[PDB]
Write an enzyme that holds these catalytic residues in place. Structure first.
Site, PDB file in Angstrom:
ATOM      1  CE  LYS B  77      -2.926   1.574   3.284  1.00 22.53           C
ATOM      2  NZ  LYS B  77      -4.089   1.392   4.135  1.00 22.53           N
ATOM      3  NE  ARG B 121      -5.740  -0.856   6.686  1.00 18.72           N
ATOM      4  CZ  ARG B 121      -4.954   0.001   7.312  1.00 18.72           C
ATOM      5  NH1 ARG B 121      -5.410   0.735   8.306  1.00 18.72           N
ATOM      6  NH2 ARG B 121      -3.668   0.095   6.949  1.00 18.72           N
ATOM      7  N   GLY B 234      -6.077   7.905  15.112  1.00 14.32           N
ATOM      8  CA  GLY B 234      -5.212   8.893  14.464  1.00 14.32           C
ATOM      9  C   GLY B 234      -3.773   8.431  14.499  1.00 14.32           C
TER      10      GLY B 234
END
Ligand SMILES: NC(=O)c1ccc[n+]([C@@H]2O[C@H](COP(=O)([O-])OP(=O)(O)OC[C@H]3O[C@@H](n4cnc5c(N)ncnc54)[C@H](O)[C@@H]3O)[C@@H](O)[C@H]2O)c1
Ligand SMILES: NC(=O)c1ccc[n+]([C@@H]2O[C@H](COP(=O)([O-])OP(=O)(O)OC[C@H]3O[C@@H](n4cnc5c(N)ncnc54)[C@H](O)[C@@H]3O)[C@@H](O)[C@H]2O)c1
Lengths: 348, 353
Positions: B77, B121, B234
C-alpha cells in the site's frame, strides 16, 4: 483526477519514434545534469532503498526505491531481482514499475514500465562515470555478465567512448553465445573471452552479473592495464559483490550513492573512509576526475531512485508529445472528501 | 502476463453488489481470522512501514507499507496523509492505492484503489478490538474528529455493538455539522458534543483526528465511565498523539502492531513493558483480555499492511466473481528475457502510401 498509465506498448512506441541512440543520449544528458545539481547541493540523493529478501526459487529480493522532489512529486520504483526468471519463466531477472505521486496531494498521477527504463538509466549511469574516468581513447570494453544489463552497458558506453570491440563472458554458455546478436545494433564487434583475458586487455569493464552471495569474484585478482576503469553494476542482496578485494583496494573508488553502496555495492568490502568522492561530486567538478583517467578506477553502481525519476521524465515528455498512454481512474476520490462511501453514481 | 486493475468504478460496483454492511462484515471476519493466525504463530506481523514527511501546506507524510506472503505474493500500500486536502483541493486526506506482486517472479499482478479499502479495514480493526474490549451493551459512541475515518468507525462499531447514539466533536464546525448526514445510513442518532461531555457519557470512543505533532490531547482526562473503551485511530507523523498520558497510564492498552505503535501510536507515550497483549494475541485467545470490558481499555491503532492485504483479498474475490476490472500490460516482458530492447511496437502498414 486520473492516472496516466504508460505500459509496454507505449514504451515501445517511444523507442520506435525517438530512436534508441537518441533516447539513450537524452537519459545520459538528464542524469549528467541531475548528478551535477546534486554535486552543487541543489538537489539531494534519494533515501536508502529497502526490500524483502526471497529465498526461493533461488535467492532474490523485491525492493522499493522512493525519491521526493519537494513541492513537485514523489517517484517510487518497485523492482524484483529474480535470477531464475529467464530460464524458468522466460521473464527478465529485473521486473518493475515506476510510479509518480503529486507531492502536495499524494495522488498517483502516472505509472509506467520500469524494465526498459531501468536498463536505460543503468547504462546511462555507467556512461556518465566512464566519460569522466575512462581514457577517452578506450577501444576495448569488457563485459562480465552478458544478460539484460550488458546490452545497455554496451549501448551507452558505445555512445561516449570510441569502442572498437567488446570482450565478453558469462558463466552460462548460451547467454554468452547470444550476446553478439543482442549487441549487433551498436556496431561494436563482440568476442567471447575468459575473465582473465578481459581483465588484462580491456580499457573499460562493466560487471553486471547475477552472481550469488558467496560466489564471487567474477574477475580474477590479477594485473590490469594501468588506466582500467570498471563499472561495478551488479547489485541486489546484502553480501553480494563481484570484484576481488585486492583490485578494489588499489583503485580510486566512486559510488553513485555512498550509503547505499556501503550496504549493497562493492563498497561493502571497504571502509567508508576509503571511498573517494561520490559520482555527483565528480559531475559537478569534472576536474576532480579527469586526472584519474590514467590510473585504476571503479564506479560502484547500485542505482538510486532519482535516476528513475529522471528517466521517467524523459519518457513522459516523449509520450505527451505523441499523445501516448491511457488514463485510468484508479484512486477513489469521493464526491464528498469526508465520506468514503460517496461512490455515486453506482453502476447499473 | 498483465496487471489486473480495479479502479474507482469497479470498487464502487463491489460496494453496490455486496452492500456496505456485508462488505464491512466480510472485512471484519477476515481481519479477525488473520489476526488470530498471527496470534497463533502461523503468520507474522508486517515489517515497519516507511514514509516521506512533507511540510506544506500542512505537515503530512506519504508512506509505503509492504507485507509478504512467502511463495505467494507481496502486497504494497502506498498512501498519503495530507490533511489540507479536503479544504484546499476537495480530495480526501488519506489517498492511496494497493498493489500485489507475484512473490516468485516479482511481476505486478494487481492494482486497486486504496481509499475505500483503507477506510473499511480501519473501521473493521476498531470493530475487532471493540468486540473484545467494549461492553457488549454499549449504547453511546463518542467520536473525536468527524472526517473520513469517523464514518467507517461509526459504521463498523454499529455492526458489533448495539449503538443507539453518537456524540461527536471536531475542531472544524463545518465538519462536525455535516457528520449527521454522512452517518444517516447507519441509523445511529448523532449529536454534537464537546470533548468533555463525550468523555463523560460515551461507552466507547474513537479518536481519528488530523491533530498536529505535539498538539494533543484531543480528549480531556476528565471523569470517564469505568468501562470505557477507546480506539485511538489517528496516526501519521512521529510525535502525533491524541490521548492524555494520565488516561493511558491507567488503561489496559493493546496495540495492533507493538513496534509500529511504539513509533507512531499512542504507545509513543508508554514504555514497551507496560503494554497489554497485542491485538493478534487477543484474537488468538480472547481470554487474554478477560475482564477488560468492564475497566478502562485502549486499542492503539496505527494500521499495518497485512490488514490491507486481507481487505484487498475480499475485494479481489468479489471482483473476480463479477468479472470486474481491466487488464493492462504495464510491465515490459521482452520476448528475449536478456534483451531489454526486444520491444514490440505496432507494425507499420504494408500497402503503398
Ligand atoms: N546498478 C544498478 O543500477 C542496477 C540496475 C539493474 C540491475 N542491476 C543488477 O545487475 C545485475 C545483473 O542484472 P541483469 O538484469 O543483467 O540480470 P540477467 O539475469 O539478465 O543477467 C545476469 C547474467 O549474469 C550471469 N552470471 C551469473 N553469475 C556470473 C558470474 N559469476 N560470472 C559471469 N556471469 C555470471 C548470468 O548467467 C546472467 O546471464 C543484477 O545484480 C541486478 O540486480 C543493477
Ligand atoms: N489507524 C489506522 O489504521 C489509520 C488508517 C487511516 C487513517 N488514519 C489516520 O486517522 C486520522 C484521520 O484521518 P481521516 O482520513 O479521518 O482525515 P480527515 O481529514 O478526513 O478527518 C480528520 C478530522 O480531524 C479534525 N481535527 C483536527 N484536529 C482535531 C482536534 N484537535 N480535535 C478534533 N478534531 C480534529 C479535522 O478537522 C478533520 O475533520 C489521520 O491521522 C489518519 O492518518 C489511521
Amino acid at each position: 483526477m486520473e492516472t496516466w498509465v504508460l505500459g509496454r506498448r507505449d514504451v515501445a512506441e517511444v523507442v520506435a519514434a525517438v530512436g534508441r541512440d537518441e533516447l539513450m543520449r537524452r537519459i545520459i544528458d538528464r542524469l549528467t545534469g541531475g548528478l551535477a545539481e546534486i554535486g552543487r547541493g541543489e538537489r539531494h540523493l534519494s533515501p536508502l532503498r529497502g526490500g524483502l529478501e526471497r529465498s526461493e526459487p533461488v535467492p532474490g529480493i523485491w525492493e522499493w526505491m522512493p525519491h521526493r522532489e519537494p513541492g513537485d512529486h514523489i517517484t517510487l520504483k518497485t523492482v524484483g531481482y529474480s535470477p531464475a526468471n529467464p530460464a524458468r519463466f522466460g521473464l527478465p531477472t529485473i521486473l518493475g514499475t515506476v510510479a509518480r505521486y503529486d507531492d502536495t496531494t499524494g495522488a498517483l498521477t502516472a505509472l509506467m514500465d520500469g524494465v526498459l527504463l531501468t536498463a536505460l538509466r543503468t547504462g546511462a549511469a555507467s556512461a556518465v562515470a566512464s566519460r569522466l574516468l575512462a581514457r577517452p581513447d578506450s577501444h576495448t570494453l569488457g563485459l562480465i555478465g552478458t544478460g539484460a544489463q550488458a546490452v545497455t552497458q554496451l549501448h551507452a558506453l558505445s555512445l561516449v567512448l570510441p569502442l572498437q570491440r567488446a570482450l565478453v563472458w558469462d558463466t552460462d554458455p548460451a547467454h554468452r553465445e547470444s550476446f553478439a546478436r543482442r549487441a549487433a545494433f551498436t556496431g561494436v564487434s563482440v568476442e567471447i573471452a575468459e575473465p582473465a583475458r578481459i581483465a588484462a586487455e580491456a580499457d573499460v569493464i562493466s560487471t553486471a552479473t547475477s552472481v550469488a552471495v558467496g560466489q564471487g569474484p567474477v574477475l580474477p585478482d590479477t594485473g590490469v592495464r594501468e588506466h582500467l576503469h570498471i563499472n561495478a553494476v551488479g547489485a541486489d542482496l546484502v553480501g553480494k559483490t563481484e570484484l576481488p578485494l585486492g583490485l578494489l583496494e588499489r583503485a580510486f573508488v566512486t559510488a553513485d550513492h555512498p550509503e547505499q553502496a556501503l550496504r549493497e555495492g562493492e563498497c561493502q568490502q571497504l571502509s567508508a573512509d576509503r571511498l573517494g568522492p561520490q559520482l555527483a561530486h565528480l559531475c559537478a567538478d569534472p576536474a576532480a576526475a579527469a586526472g584519474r583517467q590514467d590510473t585504476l578506477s571503479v564506479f560502484d553502481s547500485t542505482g538510486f531512485a532519482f535516476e528513475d525519476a529522471l528517466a521517467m521524465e524523459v519518457f513522459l515528455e516523449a509520450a505527451a508529445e505523441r499523445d501516448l498512454g491511457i488514463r485510468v481512474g484508479i484512486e477513489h476520490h469521493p464526491g464528498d472528501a469526508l465520506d468514503p462511501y460517496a461512490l455515486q453514481p453506482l453502476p447499473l
